[PDB]
Amino acid sequence: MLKKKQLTVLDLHPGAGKTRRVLPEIVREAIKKRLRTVILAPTRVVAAEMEEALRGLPVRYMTTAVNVTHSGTEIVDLMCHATFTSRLLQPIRVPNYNLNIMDEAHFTDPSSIAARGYISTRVEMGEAAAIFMTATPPGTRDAFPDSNSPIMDTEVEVPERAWSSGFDWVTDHSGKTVWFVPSVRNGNEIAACLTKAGKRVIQLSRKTFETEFQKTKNQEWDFVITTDISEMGANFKADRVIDSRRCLKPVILDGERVILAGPMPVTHASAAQRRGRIGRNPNKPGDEYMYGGGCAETDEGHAHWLEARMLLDNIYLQDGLIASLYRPEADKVAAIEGEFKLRTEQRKTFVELMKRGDLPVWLAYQVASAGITYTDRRWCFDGTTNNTIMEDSVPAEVWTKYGEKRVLKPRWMDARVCSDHAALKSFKEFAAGKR
């Protein structure tokens, strides 16, 4: 695997031991060969699990999620996918890694897709090797891969709202269930219904995942209600997955706004990763996978692949060259390579809007490419009437940094800034000049 111009897809089935068995073998061999190596974890939770798999090996943990004192001598770096892409974008030296290892390499967040594009381009240029570790490579059509133990697969209607009757099988279960929902708001309603029926429920989403995931170890629970973030190597001691088979798709309409379309079917890869939370224990056959819909290739035209192009157009590779998306996922977007390349000062604004601003890539781009500076929040209030953001059926209002109460009406409307209470709270803080 460790030869220049090699990209290997380590596509062992879920729970086959890619992280705990294969990865330390790869790392020892890379250290022996003096390959400057990066290991990319999708989440801080996975970064911490990797430390345990790699214990004793000379690895530099570029994450506050791991407590180790380093030698200062490590040639193997470990960081999150997002951290890698973030450092590429910033005016900071990122080593030209000889070996690039991406764990949970199916992750479809923009920074992960961009990292795969940058890495696969360096490999194609002859410069580097790469290993993408996932059961579900891009364009996989198999929602029912092999498992450590046999799984009971049943197609069944799954509730997406509070229910009173007709789903006794949901609550009649005495074990632990991981339930994939298409959104935080949908999980909130299902969670409230289960809590009312006497169940102990933990909810996981991107913003809450590190903190809340620890509850699955520290407290007794009957259900975990999770969005798609638990597709990325989250492990549970569960004997059932309930899968809505639904997700939200961010969609750019007319180059001018982002909507959260759906819910609509998941990809085959997502469905296989959802299912792959169970069947992991060869001593516990008969884990259950209950699924409420079919799959479709909903990554086609999904904003994350266009956002990935906005990131890659703004990453230095060599002179004016621009990294391509990883070939198997390159047709998910219709973009002109280089169309999103920004001049130095607009690029700095773009980066700050994503890093400090915590804005979605697409929205950060609209603001930065308009020539607006990071602290100029006038655009949060001068949109068309149909861009008015609503909070509990009334227009959302903030006090501007000038001390004026104004209706939140952004010039560019991206649905992700108000997809749940937490998102809108964060965007209100932004519009007010509070970060």
Ligand SMILES: CS(=O)(=O)Cc1nc2ccccc2[nH]1
């Ligand atoms: C024990 S340490 O030296 O803080 C490990 C480390 N090295 C880093 C380099 C860049 C960013 C974070 C980093 N954390």
